[PDB]
Amino acid sequence: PTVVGRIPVLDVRPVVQRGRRPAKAVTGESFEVSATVFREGHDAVGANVVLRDPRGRPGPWTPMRELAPGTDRWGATVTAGETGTWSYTVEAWGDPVTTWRHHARIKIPAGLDTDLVLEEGARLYERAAADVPGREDRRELLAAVDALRDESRPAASRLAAALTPQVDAVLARHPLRDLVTSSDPLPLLVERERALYGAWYEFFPRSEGTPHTPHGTFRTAARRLPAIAAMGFDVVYLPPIHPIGTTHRKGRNNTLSATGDDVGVPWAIGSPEGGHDSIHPALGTLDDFDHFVTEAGKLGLEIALDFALQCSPDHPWVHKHPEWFHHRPDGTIAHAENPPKKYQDIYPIAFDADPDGLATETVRILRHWMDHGVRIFRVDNPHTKPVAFWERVIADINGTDPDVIFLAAAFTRPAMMATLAQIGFQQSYTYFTWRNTKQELTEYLTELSGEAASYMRPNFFANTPDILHAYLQHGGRPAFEVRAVLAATLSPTWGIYSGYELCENTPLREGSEEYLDSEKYQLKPRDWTRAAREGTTIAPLVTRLNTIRRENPALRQLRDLHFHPTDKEEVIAYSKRQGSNTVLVVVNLDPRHTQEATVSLDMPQLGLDWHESVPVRDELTGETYHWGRANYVRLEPGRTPAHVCTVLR
Amino acid sequence: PTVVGRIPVLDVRPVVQRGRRPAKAVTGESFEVSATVFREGHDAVGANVVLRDPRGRPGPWTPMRELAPGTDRWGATVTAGETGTWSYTVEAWGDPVTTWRHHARIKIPAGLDTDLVLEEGARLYERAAADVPGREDRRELLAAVDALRDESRPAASRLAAALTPQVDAVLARHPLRDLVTSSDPLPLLVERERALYGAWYEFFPRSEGTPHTPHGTFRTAARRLPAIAAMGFDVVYLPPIHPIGTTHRKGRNNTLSATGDDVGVPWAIGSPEGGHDSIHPALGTLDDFDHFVTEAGKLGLEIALDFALQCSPDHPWVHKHPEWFHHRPDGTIAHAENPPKKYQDIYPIAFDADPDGLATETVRILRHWMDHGVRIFRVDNPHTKPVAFWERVIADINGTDPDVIFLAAAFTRPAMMATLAQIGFQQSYTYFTWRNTKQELTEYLTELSGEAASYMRPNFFANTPDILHAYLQHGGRPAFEVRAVLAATLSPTWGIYSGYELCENTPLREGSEEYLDSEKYQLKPRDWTRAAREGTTIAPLVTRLNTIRRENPALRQLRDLHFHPTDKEEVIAYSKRQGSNTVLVVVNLDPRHTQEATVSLDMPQLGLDWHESVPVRDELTGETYHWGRANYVRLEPGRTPAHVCTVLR
Ligand SMILES: OC[C@H]1O[C@H](O[C@H]2[C@H](O)[C@@H](O)[C@H](O)O[C@@H]2CO)[C@H](O)[C@@H](O)[C@@H]1O
């Protein structure tokens, strides 16, 4: 056997790990399958994509086209349906009819060998007809054959009877393909909509308590759900809900020693009261959790729990499974670190004494929470546990429960971030919070919406309990508004951490990304009712951004994204499309000064000619404009963070 | 099983066609194996390359290093030995000693847990020692263990006794490797020196005749060999040596009708006198060919024959194997084309009626010429015959005779050119003749000496019977000198077509790359003795260029190549290295005007500090200079095309 086939079809993409791991999509998502396709000699080729479903049924006729002249790189868009493991193949072939037409259009006018040319056409169309399944279609082609062979008609009309739009459409549907050659199949994992598309809200239930009982419970915190749903969120992310250790408990503002009342850090998991399968006694019981989950469900909210594989020194594992930790010669276990950050309140897990026991216990714990209606997990610092351990764990869980979604909370070097996604993580945290200038956002999103999108789905949190960027610190509310618009329009999954709405932006000190009086170390009650009454929350904007996402299929996908040039460094423009839905966004990244600029739209990228003028509506205001190749904008911080426009019919 | 191992080792290169085809090298050639290597957490990794020979014997210890900070991309240089199929593996591992050192260097000075730290070191070094095979090495490590454990000494000195250069060198040779993880093996094809390195001369034997017998024979043409060898060539490329058809024979200057005396085009192969396994009767017999081959061999010249799979209409195949041709409805066969070029004197071969017969006959013909001492074939227009046909043919021939070298004469689009090389062609013609400005040369050679070099070996013909570039037309002799220097110094394989020495540069017309009175259509006797006597040949320069190549291992390889900036667009500079051999070249690409410029050498790329000054000798003149970071050059066309300098000890 030869590696290369009769008609070369090479380097099909997407591909992950040379075919050893699947490429990704979700139900209803469109992406490009491509390949390098050409033949020997000078005649034309064609190609097409055969997408097969989990039962092996091929999808519809999907012809490809050359993506740029001289490159022999061909592509077509395909769309994933039901969930499961699919496959895709590229078929390449000689296209004798295109070749013959092109020659015939020169030779019949210039009078060279006309009978021989037309008879050669007739025989092609005869072979075309044999492989057409439909009777009306077959009769149409055999009619063009008899017109091609009628030697009493002028040559130009024998020809034109084979170039009619009626024949075109039969051949575009059932073309004559010579020497059909197939690539080896490549795997596609199709997962549920929520893996790619969703709005996420993070809050600490303990903070939502009462005057008589400041430490909130699942029952008091449930009161916070109707407002979260009213802001248009789909997922609630809860930091760890388990008991919290006492030995080396941290105090307020990340101090080493807790006082008597201090609540500790939820990530310091485990005490005599329980471990990763228990509920912190001050939050309530497993039943109170079921109630919280049930009430979330009625409002269209799914719960995501934090899974953090590590232990306080008081966790039961510390004595039940000493071999899950690395011990130093004196018997002690070194606290976990993430330089320059130190975690004096926890121990890391060691994996090389009993990898089987840890895997077995990890899936037991996830299955526990899954039985209680949690189908989504944020996996904390996955990059400090082995890559292959996550590969195994995710494959075990997704083998019985393929709807479960895992989110990799890894802010680390690129290779590890990409590898985690490739080995099964449905979603990834990103470098979003550190991309704030126009060049940074353009470069980064070009990467995420390009080839990386075949294996990674990004979750754009505009802030987290660990990240209050200097942009928000110095920019105030106008900066909060800009980052919300950006995050909500550039990724189909985005989120915020409670407090973001109120523009909380006081840092621990100058040059830090920690919050002052961080919620991680203390109860943080908030006056939601006052902020709403006084207009000092951006909840309305957030609510509107999520409404726009729900009304615009273009914002529920990632890969179709184009940046349009402007003449000001502080103003950025881009568009996204999905069928007949087109959304155009223009953002002023200066939160302090008003910016005016001309936005020069790449009109072909919108499906329009250069001279055209198109009606848009700014969905943030309800105002309508008429926009074409070149448009003046004026963006004043406080008043207008951005225009978020839809293209009208 | 998981795809990813305990210590991730990913995306090893070079790789060709996802591992389905081998990467390439020749005996004694060095290239870089690389990989993406990292681990979970914060401890250090190391890696190494295990290169295995055809019998499976591993090469020496070959540690890798990170190529740039923060990238997790690791590399090392390996060197291929004997010919055959080798394999290479990357091994990745935790490097506990590097990790412990780095921690210990902070914790001992700052006085934290010092006894515990030093005891942890002692135990690592104890495990190191157990695995060391040498007695003196083992005693050295166990000495450092006892110094580390001596609690009566200050902590800083217990430590310093484990960081000595004597211990360093033991551990760099036999390091402690945790959790060794291996990549899957990748294939390497190692071929003979000549596949990468050689100087090639093309001439038509028929043109080297006498007054009494103008059509040369193998016996008269042999008289031309001593001068070819004296010019330092290693390979003689002969256009087709078979009988030449009469039907539609072309006349002089590519005219359609031959007169009675016209000799025809050698590529129009075949008559009743014979086909691809015969000798043209005017060239002599098979015995005269053996004599020619033998006399070439005595001078250190190998023969490369042209293999052109096509037929004159008088070729015996036309009636013996009609199914090897595509016939039109009236039974005629269309002449071959290569738009806009037409080949009215030949028929192309069709491959889809009897691919097995064509393959079998093709290898029969190549084995015939191989029995007569031809171990190299230039395959004419391979891109008009199926890719898979060549893949099959080359694998059949190389399976019994792996020393046979094939050269792809394909000037076409990039995808086909790369594919031909990947499927087995030892050598490829290139776009060299159309890269003449400094930007064009820099861009192109950066491509060829980069990743493409794992599958393609370039042959830089400065001219061919079909290519007389406008640069040579307008530039005269000074242009011929420049292109010879460039071709000879930028690729380890280069060549010329006879007449190049004499600066033949009259085109067929303005805007054509054909020669006037082309040798393809007529006998072209040349007065070599007169040109030598009158100094009107650049034979001396050519002779000197090949001598320099034979005396400088850096010019007998392709991958080590760096371009150095100059302040003039017409002046280009570059260096090449191989062990302690460094060659530095500066060329003036203006053939009409003298150019002066400053050459600013990237000194680190030469293995030198910025302030240093290095002695060089211009091997074209014997003149010596002293050169450092910034050097004035003055290059006058006619006098000085270039400096070709060696770095002196
Ligand atoms: O109690 C352990 C530490 O918890 C936090 O650190 C978390 C961080 O908030 C989370 O996003 C990251 O992925 O994991 C670390 C460790 O679980 C506190 O900020 C630390 O001060 C605590 O020591």
Ligand SMILES: OC[C@H]1O[C@H](O[C@H]2[C@H](O)[C@@H](O)[C@H](O)O[C@@H]2CO)[C@H](O)[C@@H](O)[C@@H]1O
């Ligand atoms: O006789 C056939 C044709 O031979 C030449 O064309 C060659 C050309 O020289 C070679 O380098 C190219 O790759 O292949 C063609 C065909 O063999 C003449 O230049 C043509 O005019 C002849 O028709």
